[PDB]
Design a protein around this ligand. Sequence first.
Ligand SMILES: Nc1nc2c(ncn2[C@@H]2O[C@@H]3COP(=O)(O)O[C@H]4[C@@H](O)[C@H](n5cnc6c(=O)[nH]c(N)nc65)O[C@@H]4COP(=O)(O)O[C@H]3[C@H]2O)c(=O)[nH]1
Length: 264
Amino acid sequence: VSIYDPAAADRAEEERIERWVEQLREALVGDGFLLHYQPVLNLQGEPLELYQAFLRLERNGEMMSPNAFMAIAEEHDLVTEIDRWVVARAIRQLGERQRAGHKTHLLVRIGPNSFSDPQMIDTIREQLAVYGVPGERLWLQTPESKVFTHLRNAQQFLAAVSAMDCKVGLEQFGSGLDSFQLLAHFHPAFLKLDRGITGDIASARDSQEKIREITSRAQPAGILTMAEFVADAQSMSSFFSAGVDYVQGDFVAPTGPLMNYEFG
Ligand SMILES: Nc1nc2c(ncn2[C@@H]2O[C@@H]3COP(=O)(O)O[C@H]4[C@@H](O)[C@H](n5cnc6c(=O)[nH]c(N)nc65)O[C@@H]4COP(=O)(O)O[C@H]3[C@H]2O)c(=O)[nH]1
C-alpha cells in the first residue's frame, strides 16, 4: 500500500508533467517529432499538389497525437518552438519533394505566439532559401479566433511572410459579421471554414447559406475557400456546388506518412 502523503502526491503529478515537458524538449533536440500529411483536394478546376501537415510525436514505439501533449506544451510555453519545428521540417519536406521532381505545397499550422516570433520568420526566410523552395509552396494557417485577439501581430506576420510569397490563411473561419469585418482588416490568402458550418452542409439549409455568404465574398476578393473533415460524397458535392475551392478529410484521403495522393 502507498500511504497518502499530499506533498509526495503533488510532487508525483509535477513529475508526470515534468517528464512530458522533458520529452517534448528531447523531441525538439532529437528530431522526435514527425509530420504526417493529408491531401487537400481542389474542387474548382485547379489541381494543386497540396497537403496539410499534421504533427506526431514518436515516443518509444508510439506515434502520438498532439492530443497527448499539446496542453502540456501550451502550459510550458513550448508551442512556439514546436510550431517552428513543424515549419522548418515542412520546408525541408518541400525541398526534398522539389528535388525529387514534385511541386508539393504544404499547409502548416502556426499559433499566435508565432506571429511575433522573430525565429519563426527567420526559419521561414532561411529554410526556404536553403532548400531553394519558392515561398508559394508554403501555406500557413492560424485559427481565426487567434487573429481576433492578436490582430496587429497577425497583420505583421501576414506581411512578413507574404513577402516570401507564402500564403497565410485562417482556419476555423466563421460566418458571422465579425468574420466579414475581420476580412476588411486582415487579408488572408485562404479561409478554411469552421466545421460548425461545414459538417452538415449536405442536409442543412443554414450551413449552405453560410458557406455561400463566405464564398460570395471570398471569390471576388481572391481568397481561396477550404472545407475540412469532409466525410462523404454528398458533402464533397455540396462544397463543389457552393464554390468552395478545396476540401480535405478522410473521405478525400486519410492523413499518413506518404505523399502518394494522385492529384492529376
Ligand atoms: N484538422 C483536420 N483534422 C483531421 C481531418 N480529417 C481527419 N483529421 C484528424 O482529426 C484530428 C482533428 O484535430 P484538430 O482539430 O485538427 O486538432 C489538432 C491540433 O490541435 C493539433 N495538431 C495536429 N497537428 C498539428 C500541427 O502540425 N501543429 C499544431 N500546432 N497542432 C497540431 O493536434 C490536434 C489533433 O491532431 P491529430 O492527432 O492529427 O488529429 C486530427 C487529424 O488527424 C481534417 O479534415 N482536418
